[PDB]
Amino acid sequence: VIEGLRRARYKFPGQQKIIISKKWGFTPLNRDEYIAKKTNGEVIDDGAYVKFLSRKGNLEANLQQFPNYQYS
Amino acid sequence: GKSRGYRSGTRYAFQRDFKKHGAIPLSTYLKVYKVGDIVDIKANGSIQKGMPHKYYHGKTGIVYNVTKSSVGVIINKVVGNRYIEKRVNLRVEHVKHSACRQEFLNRVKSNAAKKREAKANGETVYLKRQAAKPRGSRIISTEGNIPQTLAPVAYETFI
Amino acid sequence: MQKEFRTSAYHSRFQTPFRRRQEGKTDYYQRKRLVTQHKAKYNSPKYRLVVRFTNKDIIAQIVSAHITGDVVFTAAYAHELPRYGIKYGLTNWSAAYAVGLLVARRALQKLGLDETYTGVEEVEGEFELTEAVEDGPRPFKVFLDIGLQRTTTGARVFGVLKGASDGGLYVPHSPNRFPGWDIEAEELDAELLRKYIFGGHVAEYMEELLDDDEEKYKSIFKNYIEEEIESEDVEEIYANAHEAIRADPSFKPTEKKFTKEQYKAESKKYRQQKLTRAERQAKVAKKIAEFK
Amino acid sequence: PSAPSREVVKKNTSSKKSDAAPASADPAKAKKK
Amino acid sequence: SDKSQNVMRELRIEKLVLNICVGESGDRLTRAAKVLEQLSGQTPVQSKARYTVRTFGIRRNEKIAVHVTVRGPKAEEILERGLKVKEYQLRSKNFSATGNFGFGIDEHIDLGIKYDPSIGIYGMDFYVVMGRAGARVTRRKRARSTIGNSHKTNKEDTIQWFKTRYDAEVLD
RNA sequence: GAGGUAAAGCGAAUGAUUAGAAGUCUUGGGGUUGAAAUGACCUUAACUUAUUCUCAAACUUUAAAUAUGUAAGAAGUCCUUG
RNA sequence: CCUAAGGGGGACUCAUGGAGAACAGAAAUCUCCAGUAGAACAAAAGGGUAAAAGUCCCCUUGAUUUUGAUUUUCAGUGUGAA
RNA sequence: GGUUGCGGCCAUAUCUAGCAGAAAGCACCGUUCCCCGUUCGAUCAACCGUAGUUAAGCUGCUAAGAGCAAUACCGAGUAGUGUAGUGGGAGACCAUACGCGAAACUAUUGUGCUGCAAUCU
Fold it and tell me: Is C132 exposed, middle or buried (0-12, 13-18, 19+ CB in 10 A)?
């Protein structure tokens, strides 16, 4: 994939850097936080993305939407 | 085609505040203005009568005339190399008392109150305000506060 | 199928009306027109004759406006009338007249304008304004405030208006809203207005219903039946009430069987109290735990 | 007899076709064929 | 509290509106108004088209329809006379989500009034607005408010009340 | 006191805009069901819900820095009364 | 451009959506609910306006008389407008 | 303390869904001779307070509620910016020096207060 982007760099003017992200895929979570929230049941799939548990709002709907949520 | 009408460029200045449209609270119509009062000018868009020109939006002046629903305010405007006194007629919806008076009027009474007491106690007191002076010496004790050593952090990319 | 309307964006940008406008009680357009004083009369307050009609009561207050809130000058209630000899029909047009007269006399006694500005002594139903006495204090000037109540010729608010005007208050008005005004021949019939002043319409109803529908008479005019009050002698009840009000309009508060503290302690018993943050946190924890 | 008329409360002073009155938006009324 | 079988929760007819939407203005509309007067004993009101539509052949402000509102016992009498024509047989999809209901007669002479060939025959829309006591809360000028959720009229309550009062069948 | 520029925002109004997911199609068609039932099924397209990527000189809840108005007393404050 | 589209007062609430009613259907009229203005306010655009400045009804001529003051453009002249 | 009338600030007050409300008040509630207004006493007007009810309105409470408000070893002294250099860089732009300094985000808390008059178990 890097070599794919390195070639793409030739089609652009200016300087571009290829950077390996610290985050899991396109999520805003670092690769260890995402694993922790996955094993804590706080993250569910939504197709090509995910949805994260909120400690806010209606309690009942929150519980139904995230069944595997190990509360602390 | 230049356009320089009366209310040109007042798209945002004469707008009502967000979630503050509609009727005017009546404390505006209950305040009493006397000749010689210091008032602030802020045009209210919902009242198109007695509206100041955009120049006077945000200016402070002296009330010199009081009429049925308005006050006459005096503003000094720079026109070239001198000031000109302008006499603006404003409905009281566009006018508010200037709060700069009250703080100074409080100091006038406060100063007199302190001064007369010093005469009573046979002492003297200095009434002039003082700018914040440099701070004096002090001793910093370190029980529970042993200094933490901080160092600059290494560069790291956070995307 | 359609966009859900009550979104969080709808709530965020909603500008709630004024507190007493959302209550549906204050018309701020009319309030602005009434309260606002000519700025060159710097601190002289305008006085409002606030007239309100409940299902069981008439309230007539004299009010001046201030930034902290309105301040009551004097007040007259319809449930004061039993002290003055009117026990029934406390929401008549004539009860309204009595309340207006009472508030007028009470305010004038509070000011000191009793010898001067006695008012219309011989209530005849003529339209008339409180005329100022030369070389003396001007009559107390009050402006009628009917709130959200609709203006109709024959309405009870103008009964309070007429009572106050006959009591010596200078309340500007035109006679085209009194019961008895002919629009086609623009003059005020004094006899019909006088009839309405002294309960003539109620007496006529008793006369008409008694000899036509006696059962409805027994159900409706019961309190008059147990009082042995006939249709003919009602006029004298209001006539004596007027004289009694003019004799002594001062305010007598009702004796209270409990102290303010006793009332507060009694009422505080039936008031639910808000939960502690800890209590509701415990409730949330219990609900989650019982959800597994 | 008197002939009262229902009073107008709407604000559309213009003279045009009503909002959301398009053709083909209807179901097939002869879908039973 | 909040007892379901309170007295004041008693459903009863608010009003009955009779609508004849004759698509033109003139003799037909005047005769329809005559029919409405005969049926109700009240002068009806003539409603105007809001916009011009060529397919329906109407223009703005042409007095198209006529209608009248009846309240009280007269509404009940007219409603039962109209339910006879429908032989006390309504459908589940004749009741709105707000608990109102309505139907339509095709020939007004079936209501039981003298037939005049000159006047002709018209169909008619009966609409019954249901409501409990305390609806004045939403209509009075001062202190106007809304009606609580329990006190609201809905489809199932209206259907049950209709069946109980009329022993009629609602074809679900 | 005044301001609406920089910045910011778009799971905030207006406008622009990428991608799926779950639903409703009952007011989208196609195919396949039926001897005829619009009553289903597979499908794409529509909408709705919760998300998602990216924007605005003539969009905006928010909102600087700099610049800008006024005041800082004897022509003042207070007390009494013509 | 307007004798109302000016003035005063009063009553009412708009765009739109949903759920319903013979002909009637995506579009006629009627009813209820929701509806912060997503409507309308002669004409550009911007601002403003909800028991109204919007829709409808009642009465009107203040779109009148006298000559001063003030604001904008500004020389602090005129004209216009306020 | 509850309630009414009139208010001040104008969501910490609004909105959704539930539950409770003693006294009083308010309210819904009843009637159409009269004044008055309507297609319609529904709204408005008048009359009774008499026949009834807290069902609703109203008030309070509940919600890991929506919204709103406030606070911050939250983000962040970041973005931006005033001033400076014969600083860097081909440029685009960037760093540094002396100053000022956000917004979103995150988290926590809160959910009307109050004036005058009257009234109340």
Answer: middle
